[PDB]
Amino acid sequence: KITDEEELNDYKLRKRKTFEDNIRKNRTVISNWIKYAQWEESLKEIQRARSIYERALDVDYRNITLWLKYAEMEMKNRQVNHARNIWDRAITTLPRVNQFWYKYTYMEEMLGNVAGARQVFERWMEWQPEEQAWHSYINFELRYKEVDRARTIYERFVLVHPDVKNWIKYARFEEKHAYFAHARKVYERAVEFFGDEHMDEHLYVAFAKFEE
Amino acid sequence: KKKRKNPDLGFSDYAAAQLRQYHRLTKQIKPDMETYERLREKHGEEFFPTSNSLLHGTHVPSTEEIDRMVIDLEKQIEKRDKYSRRRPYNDDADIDYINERNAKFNKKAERFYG
Amino acid sequence: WIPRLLEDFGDGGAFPEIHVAQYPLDMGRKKKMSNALAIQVDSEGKIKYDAIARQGQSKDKVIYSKYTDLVPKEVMNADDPDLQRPDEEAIKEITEKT
Amino acid sequence: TMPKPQWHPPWKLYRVISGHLGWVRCIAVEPGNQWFVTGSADRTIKIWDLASGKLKLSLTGHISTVRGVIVSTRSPYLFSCGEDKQVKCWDLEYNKVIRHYHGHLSAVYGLDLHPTIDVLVTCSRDSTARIWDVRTKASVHTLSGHTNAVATVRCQAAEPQIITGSHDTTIRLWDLVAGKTRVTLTNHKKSVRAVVLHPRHYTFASGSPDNIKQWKFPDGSFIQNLSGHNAIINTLTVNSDGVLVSGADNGTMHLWDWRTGYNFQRVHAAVQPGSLDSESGIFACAFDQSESRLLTAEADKTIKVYREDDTATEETHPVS
Amino acid sequence: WQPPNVYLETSMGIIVLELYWKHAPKTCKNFAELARRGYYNGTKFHRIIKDFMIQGGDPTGTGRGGASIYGKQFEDELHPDLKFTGAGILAMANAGPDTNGSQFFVTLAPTQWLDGKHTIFGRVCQGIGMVNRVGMVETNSQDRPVDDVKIIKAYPSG
Amino acid sequence: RKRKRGVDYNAEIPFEKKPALGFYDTSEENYQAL
Amino acid sequence: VIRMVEMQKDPMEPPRFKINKKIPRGPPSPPAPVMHSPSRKMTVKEQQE
C-alpha cells in the first residue's frame, strides 16, 4: 500500500513511463493507447485521458473502438457536453458507421432531449442509410405517440427503399393503428407504383388479407 | 398474454451484435409524456426540425436526468464485461500443454485439424 | 411603465424613450465567454455542419462531407464544354510561373 | 439509363513475347513509336522493337525489381526506378546511367515526368512523393501526408499538377509549386493502385478492387462508377477514342467505354506453357502511340500484344 | 406609406423591425422604400462589434457604398427622448451629419455613445435571439466577420 | 538532477492535445478528484 | 525611418549551432470525412470460409 504523496507519485511515474515507452515502441496497435487512457481515467486524471485519446485519433482515426471508448469515458464522468462534441465529430467524419448514430441518439434520448434526438435522426436519414435505421427512427417516433410523424417517415422510407416488403410493412403499420382508408390508399399506390412487369405474389397476398 | 423468442447466431459483423443490443435497450425505455408535453408547450414549432431547419443553442439537462444515462452506462458496461464465458479450470483431462498460452494454442489447433 | 421582465415586450422591442436598459428577448446582458464555435447557417437557412469537419482550416480546402457528393452526376455527354482542358495559352502561363 | 454507348470494335491477341526471367512490372513506349521498354523483377531493362517484336538491347544496372520506366519526350533520357530505393537516368546516346536521384527511404513504386518543365515525381513506400529537379538531382519538394505506401503518381501541366493514389485508400491532388495537398478523396474502400488522366477531357479515373471511379478536375468532383471488375486492379489505360483498359491482378482484363462506362469486352488470356495457373496477372499495360496496339506486361514473364479486330460490326458484336 | 414591420429574413435568422415614423418619418420612409425595393439582398455585415453593434446594408460591403431614397444621403431626423439605451435600436449610422445613406445599424446593448450622432429610428420586433447569436460570432480585425452572413429576403410590412 | 525526458511524465501532460471545440460549450464542465 | 545594413560574415567561422535535434512528428491535418458506400453483410458461412 502507498502511504502517501511521494510513493504513489513514483508508482504513477513507473506505470506512466512504461505506457509511454510501449507507445513509442509501436505507435500502432491501439490496445496500448486504450490501456493507457483507461488507466489514467481509473485514477480520475481525465485531462490526461483526453490528451491520450486525442493523440490516438491522430494516429488512426478510422478505428471505431477508439471513438467508442472515448465517448464512453466522457459520458461516465458526466461531461455531457464533451460527449456531445465527440459524438458530433464522430458522425461527421465516419458517417457510414452506424453504431455512432445509434449511440448518439440513444444518449440524447436518455438525457431527455427529444428535440435533439430528432435532429440527429434527420441528419442520419439524409444519408439514406438502411432499413434498420428507418425502423429505429419510426420506433423512436412510436415510443412517443406522434403517429403522423411516423407516417411521414414511412413516406420517405418506401421511396428510399422501394421493396414490396416495405410497402407491406407500411400498410400493416397504418392498419394496426386503424387507419383503414389510408391503408387502402397505400395498397392502391403500391400496385400502381410497382407496375405489372415486376408484380408478384406477396403483395397481393397481403392485400387480400387486408380486404378479407 | 404475450410470447416471443430470439435465437443467437454467428456474430457475423460487430454491427449485428450492436444492433441486437440496441434493440433490447430501446425496448426497455419508457418515456414520460408529461415531460414531453411540458417541453412541448414551451418550444412548439422548434420541436420538429429537419436536419437543416431549426436551431436553439443548447438544451441544458437537470442532473437527475444525467444520472439515468450514467446508470444505464454502468449496466451496459457490466453486461459487456461478461462477453466471454470462461470454461472452469478442469484438470481432469490429459495435460500436453506447458503453460496457459500453450494450452490455448493446442485448443485452437484442435479446432482446425480433425 | 418601465419594462423589467421581457414579458412586457409582448412580441419584443426596446423602449428607446424608457430610461431603462431594455433586455428584450435575452437582450443587453453580456454573457460568459463560452467555447462553442459559431453555429453558422447557410444561405438558405440550413445548418452548415461543414464547419466541424473544416475545423481550423482555410477556405482553400475543398471538403467533401455531404451525402450529395456521392451521387453520380449525369455527365454522360461527349460534348459539354464544361470539361475541356484549359486553352494552351493559360497552360503556358502556368508553366512559366511554375 | 444512359444514351447508348458508342460501338468500339473488340481486340484480339496476336503476339506473345517471352524473354524475361521474372515478372514484368512496367512498360512504356518511345515518343517516335519505334520501340518499347520493359522493366522486370530480374533487374534488367529490355528494349524491344515494336514492329517485329525482336529484342534490341538489355540494360542491367539495378540491384532489384525495376518497378517503373518512362521515356522523356523532350530529351533522350530514360528514367527508371527500382525497389533498391534508387532512381536512375539513362542517357540513350551512350546507353549508360548519367544521373541518380537519392533520398527515398524505401522501395520506389512509380514515377512520372512533367510534360513541360524538367522535373520528376516519384512515389515510394515510405509514404511520400518527391519532386526532383532533372538537371541537378536535387529534391525540391517532399509531398508528404499519406499514411501508407504511395502506390501511384501521375502528373500533368494543367492544375492540379500531381495526383497520387496510395494504399491507405485515399487519393490526393497536390499543387506542384506550393507543395501541399489541395484535395483528398476518400471514396474508395481499398488501396488505389491505378490512376489515369483522360487525354482530352479534364477528367480522370481511379481504380480499386471495389470499382473504378471517375472524377472531374480540378477539385475532383465525383462523376460516376464503373463496376463489374472485382479484382485487384493494377493498371488503367485510356485510348484517345474513349476505350479504357482495366487490367487486374488475376490476369483478367476488362475493356470499357470511357464515356458511359459500359464494359464491352472481357479478356481472360492463357498462361505461358510452364506456368502455374496461380501465376496469371497483369502488371502494366500501355497503348501504342498510334493507339492501335495494346501491350501488356504480365506475371508469367510474357508481353502480350493486342490489336483491334477489323472484321467485326455493330451487328456481329452488338452493344447490350 | 409607413410600413410597420419590415421583414428582413437574414440567412442566420428571421427579422422584422418596427420604425417609428412619428419620431423618424424621413428614415422610416427611406428604410421602408429600400426594403420593398429589394436592393438590400446581398448586403454583407460590414461591422460586427461583439455586444455593441451589427451594422450592414452596404451595396459594396466595405463601408464606402450606400445610397438613400432621396439621392446619396439626407439629414438626420433627431428625437429628444429616443436613445440607444437598449439592444435593437435601428438607426442608420453616418460618418458625418446630414449624410446618412443606405447603411443600417442594430444595437446589441445600451449605446448611449451613439446618441446624438445616429438617429434612433425604431426597434427590431423580430429575431432578437438571432441578433444575439450574430453578435456572438467571431469577426476579423476589420469587423467584416469571417462568416459572410447576408439577408435572404428583404421586404416591408404589408 | 540530470535526466532529460523523465519529468515528461509526472510533471506535465506529456504531449498535450486539447480536444477540439464544437457547437457546444465545454467551459463549465469540470471534474472531480480521486 | 530606419537604415538596415547586414552584418559581415566572417569567412573563417565554423557553424555555430547544433542542428541534429530529434522530436516526434507533429499532429497531421484535420481528418477528412470517410465518404464510403454503405457496408454490406458477411454471412456466418463466409467468415467460416
Q: Are D205 and D236 in contact (CB under 8 A)?
A: yes
Q: What is the DSSP string of chain A?
A: ---SHHHHHHHHHHHHHHHHHHHHHHS--THHHHHHHHHHHHTT-HHHHHHHHHHHHHH-TT-HHHHHHHHHHHHHTT-HHHHHHHHHHHHHH-TT-HHHHHHHHHHHHHTT-HHHHHHHHHHHHTT---HHHHHHHHHHHHHS--HHHHHHHHHHHHHHS--HHHHHHHHHHHHHTT-HHHHHHHHHHHHHHH-TTT--HHHHHHHHHHH-
Q: Are E66 and E101 in contact (CB under 8 A)?
A: yes
Q: Are D80 and D68 in contact (CB under 8 A)?
A: yes
CA-atom Rg of chain C in angstroms: 26
Residue C83 and residue D200: Cβ atoms within 8 Å?
no
Tell whether B99 is within 8 A of chain G (Cβ): no
Query: What CA–CA distance (Å, rounded) separates C50 from C65?
Result: 7
Q: What are phi and psi of B36, to 5 degrees?
A: -60, -50
Q: Are D9 and D308 in contact (CB under 8 A)?
A: yes
For chain G, what's the residue count? 49
* CA dihedral angle for residue D296, residue D302, residue D303, residue D309, rounded to 10 degrees: -80
* Sequence-distant (≥ 6) Cβ neighbours of residue G17 within 8 angstroms: none
Considering all CA atoms of chain G, what is the largest pairwise distance in Å, rounded to the nearest integer? Answer: 82
Nearest to A96 among G27, G31, G36 (CB): G36
Query: What CA–CA distance (Å, rounded) separates A49 from A27?
Result: 17
Q: Is E71 helix (H, G, I), strand (E, B) or coil?
A: strand
Selection from A146, A162, A170, A157 nearest residue A199 by Cα: A162
Place of cell 461591422: E47
Q: Are E127 and E13 in contact (CB under 8 A)?
A: yes
Q: Choosing among D126, D186, D188, D210, which should be mutated to test the G contact, i.e. which has the most G CBs within 10 A?
A: D186
Helix (H) or strand (E) holding G5: none
Residue B12 and residue G41: Cβ atoms within 8 Å?
yes
Q: Is B107 helix (H, G, I), strand (E, B) or coil?
A: helix
Q: Are E109 and C28 in contact (CB under 8 A)?
A: yes
- Give the amino acid at B55: L
Tell whether G29 is within 8 A of chain C (Cβ): yes
Written as nine digits, the cell of A39 is 488507466
Written as nine digits, the cell of E75 is 439629414
Q: Are D38 and D301 in contact (CB under 8 A)?
A: no
DSSP state of E77: -
Tell whether D70 is within 8 A of chain C (Cβ): no
Tell whether E157 is within 8 A of chain C (Cβ): no
Q: Are E137 and E145 in contact (CB under 8 A)?
A: yes
Chain B neighbors of G49, CB-CB under 8 A? none
Q: Are B72 and B29 in contact (CB under 8 A)?
A: no
* Sequence-distant (≥ 6) Cβ neighbours of residue B14 within 8 angstroms: A99
Written as nine digits, the cell of C20 is 431603462
Q: Verify cis geometry, omega within 30 degrees of 0, for the bond prior to D160.
A: yes
Q: Are D124 and D153 in contact (CB under 8 A)?
A: no
Query: What CA–CA distance (Å, rounded) separates D38 from D297?
Result: 8
What are the start-end ranges of the H helices in E1-158?
25-37, 128-136
Query: What CA–CA distance (Å, rounded) separates C47 from C39?
Result: 8
Chain A neighbors of F11, CB-CB under 8 A? none
Written as nine digits, the cell of B32 is 414520460
First-to-last alpha carbon distance for chain G, in angstroms, is: 80
Instruction: Name the active-site residue from E23, E118, E123, E144.
Output: E118
In total, the C-beta contacts within 8 angstroms joining chain B to chain G are: 16
Query: What CA–CA distance (Å, rounded) separates C19 from C42?
Result: 38
Q: Are D22 and D67 in contact (CB under 8 A)?
A: no
- Give the amino acid at D75: S
Domain range list for chain E: 1-158
> What total number of domains does chain A contain?
1
Which CATH topology does E1-158 take?
A: Cyclophilin (2.40.100)
Task: Based on DSSP, count helices (H) and strands (E) in chain C, helices before strands.
Answer: 2, 0
Q: Verify cis geometry, omega within 30 degrees of 0, for the bond prior to D218.
A: yes
Using CB atoms within 10 Å of the CB of residue D290, give its burial: 0 to 12 exposed, 13 to 18 middle, 19+ buried: exposed
Lateral strand order in the sheet of D96-101: D66-71, D77-82, D87-91, D96-101
Examine chains G and C and say if they touch (3+ CB pairs below 8 A). yes
Written as nine digits, the cell of F25 is 460549450
As a three-state string, the secondary structure of chain D is CCCCCCCCCCEEEEEEECCCCCCEEEEEECCCCCEEEEEECCCCEEEEECCCCCEEEEECCCCCCEEEEEECCCCCEEEEEECCCCEEEEECCCCEEEEEECCCCCCEEEEEECCCCCEEEEEECCCEEEEEECCCCCEEEEEECCCCCCCEEEECCCCCCEEEECCCCCEEEEECCCCEEEEEECCCCCCCCEEEECCCCCEEEEECCCCEEEEECCCCEEEEEECCCCCCEEEEEECCCCEEEEEECCCEEEEEECCCCCEEEEEECCCCCCCCCCCCCEEEEEECCCCCEEEEEECCCCEEEEEECCCCCCCCCCCC
Experimental method: cryo-EM
Calculate how close chain C gets to F32, using CA atoms only, in Å: 21
DSSP state of B63: H
Q: Is B92 helix (H, G, I), strand (E, B) or coil?
A: coil
Selection from D50, D49, D92, D54 nearest residue D70 by Cα: D92
- Chains adjacent to G (≥3 CB pairs closer than 8 angstroms): A, B, C, D
Helix (H) or strand (E) holding E153: strand E151-155
Domain of A70, in residue numbers:
3-212
Selection from E158, E156, E135 nearest residue E56 by Cα: E135
